């Protein structure tokens, strides 16, 4: 629920020399539209030599998942900043939406690399259509034949402070 | 809290009554206070404020 995927379309303000400026689109993963347009201007100012004051947002639109109940494996390409430099990396996630995999990626780079949201650029998110496009074993092990596994040591969550029967963990 | 734009609890700084204790001056002030309150003629308001003035603010004519 943290994030949505938006398209943001913008251009330069029309002038006499350039009456029909080119339209540029970006795919932005943001909590809301304010942050979405902010990210769009951030990236346009880094790539091209355009500022917010001389441009305008043309369109902001939710991009919904095509198949929100189909299990997918995603590849994500990232540029992130560590404490000591700038690095590119590629990771894989399993989810039913692109936004879900992106939220997991943000949690994952927070957990393993101490990489905050401000320190990550999402280069590309791709649905991996073939089992041969899946590279990482930590997701590849969930794509095997007749997958099954137990859940040992079930801890039941009680509504009372004191229990009159011995604890059990069967399941 | 308030970010006060002006100084708080400021008296107007204009005399609202004679400092004099003369009873007959106060009778005149009573008359012209009624007149200034009930007539909207500027002359009466001017006369009312003049009765409040101190001695150096009423030079002899």
């Amino acid at each position: 629920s943290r994030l949505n995927e938006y398209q943001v379309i913008g251009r330069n303000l029309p002038t006499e020399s350039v009456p029909e400026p080119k339209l540029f689109r970006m795919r932005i993963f943001a909590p809301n539209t304010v942050v979405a347009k902010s990210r769009y201007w951030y990236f346009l100012q880094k790539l091209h030599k355009v500022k917010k004051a001389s441009g305008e947002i043309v369109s902001v639109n939710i991009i919904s998942e095509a198949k929100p109940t189909k299990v997918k494996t995603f590849g994500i390409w990232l540029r992130y900043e560590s404490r000591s430099g700038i690095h590119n990396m590629y990771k894989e996630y399993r989810d039913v939406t692109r936004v879900g995999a992106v939220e997991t990626m943000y949690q994952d780079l927070a957990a393993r690399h101490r990489a905050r949201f401000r320190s990550i650029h999402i280069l590309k998110v791709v649905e991996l259509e073939k089992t041969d496009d899946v590279k990482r074993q930590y997701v590849k092990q969930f794509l095997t034949k007749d997958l099954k596994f137990p859940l040992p040591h079930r801890v039941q969550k009680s509504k009372k402070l004191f229990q009159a029967t011995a604890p059990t963990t069967f399941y | 809290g308030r970010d006060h734009t002006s100084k708080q609890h400021v008296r107007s700084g204009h005399r609202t009554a004679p400092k004099s204790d003369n009873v007959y001056l106060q009778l005149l002030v009573k008359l012209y206070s009624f007149l200034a309150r009930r007539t909207d003629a500027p002359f009466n308001k001017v006369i009312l404020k003049s009765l409040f003035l101190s001695k150096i603010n009423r030079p002899p004519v």
């Binding site: 398209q7 689109r25 639109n61 991009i63 095509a66 | -």
Partner: protein, 51 residues
């Protein structure tokens, strides 16, 4: 002597806004909109999905 909220007191609402009676009696708050079923995005705009 007492401020009464027009959003709460109906009499104060009608004292300030006479049209509130017409708005309520004409069900303006839940008025239907007549139009046709259309899908104007089915062409190029579907580039929201991929460029």
């Amino acid at each position: 002597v007492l401020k009464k909220n027009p959003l709460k007191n109906k009499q104060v609402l009608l004292r300030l806004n006479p049209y509130a009676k017409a708005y309520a009696a004409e069900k303006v708050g839940s008025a239907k909109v007549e139009q046709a079923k259309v899908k104007p995005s089915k062409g190029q705009f579907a580039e929201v999905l991929k460029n």
